[PDB]
Write a protein that binds this ligand. Structure first.
Ligand SMILES: CC1(C)SCCN(S(=O)(=O)c2ccc(OCC#CCN)cc2)[C@H]1C(=O)NO
Ligand SMILES: [Zn+2]
Length: 259
């Protein structure tokens, strides 16, 4: 049975200056509200999911803390930060290499990451080949690094404890803002990774249904559009992975749903 005291993964949500400016129109209230609403809509998907196809449901996400970054992180030569104006490594391209950004983020945000189930970055940059987000995949293993629940690993190079309870979402793609319903999907998918799911096996009928059958599920390896009914749901494949991870990890860092 679910523990009503341990059914909610509380988030740190960060908006960088690219998100603030383009998505939030350079207004704290707009940015803040957009993200509060997005997460609440992603929460409705999670909370309503029955992970064992019976009564293991009511698991969700809520914002512990939001951080809004109004202007770029001023950076010295040879220096880098996830909120810096420059795209790393190629400063000519509009966007970072996504893996490097999540790594930079996890590194820069480490102190705050330690207090939360998950940290999520929201940005506004155009990643190569239509990439929209990235996140560490969670696991039932206590020893595991990645996904739900802060687990320190010492980094000799970074001179500190790091945490891999992190993920990112971008709302820009192919030169334009993506649909609202697409943004819900990216964050659902990336948090899906955090919660223990790998990508759906692409030839498996049950976990990758044909269009007549409702279309693909949200962990499909190629971005679903949101036009089809299955697109915002989790497959049995994802359910099984996430179920195990929640079973193990809820006790560790899940909290009570707040009003
Ligand atoms: C690391 C990856 C390049 S591997 C290939 C899939 N993507 S992605 O194209 O950026 C992507 C795909 C689907 C997503 O969510 C559903 C949606 C939508 C809106 N159309 C989000 C990102 C990344 C990946 O696996 N990230 O976890
Ligand atoms: Zn993915």
């Amino acid at each position: 049975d679910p523990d009503p005291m341990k059914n909610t993964c509380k988030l740190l949500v960060v908006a960088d200056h690219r998100f603030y400016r383009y998505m939030g129109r350079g207004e704290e209230s707009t940015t803040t509200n957009y993200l509060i609403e997005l997460i609440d809509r992603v929460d409705d998907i999670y909370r309503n999911t029955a992970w064992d196809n019976a009564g293991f449901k009511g698991y969700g996400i809520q914002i512990e803390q939001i951080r809004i970054l109004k202007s770029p992180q001023e950076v010295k030569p040879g220096e880098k930060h996830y909120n810096m104006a420059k795209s790393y490594p190629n400063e000519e391209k509009d966007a970072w290499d996504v893996k490097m950004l999540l790594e930079q983020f996890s590194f820069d945000i480490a102190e705050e990451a330690s207090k939360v189930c998950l940290a999520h970055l929201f940005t506004y940059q155009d990643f190569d080949m239509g990439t929209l987000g990235l996140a560490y995949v969670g696991s039932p293993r206590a020893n595991s690094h990645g996904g739900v629940c802060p687990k320190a690993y010492y980094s000799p190079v970074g001179k500190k404890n790091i945490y891999l309870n992190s993920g990112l979402t971008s709302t820009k793609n192919y030169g334009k803002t993506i649909l609202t319903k697409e943004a819900d999907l990216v964050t659902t998918h990336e948090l899906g990774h955090n919660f223990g799911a790998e990508h759906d096996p692409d030839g498996l009928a049950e976990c990758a249904p044909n269009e007549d059958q409702g279309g693909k599920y949200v962990m499909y390896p190629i971005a679903v559009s949101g036009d089809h009914e299955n697109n915002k749901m989790f497959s049995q494949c994802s359910k099984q992975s996430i179920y195990k991870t929640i079973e193990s990890k809820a006790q560790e860092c899940f909290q009570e749903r707040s009003n």
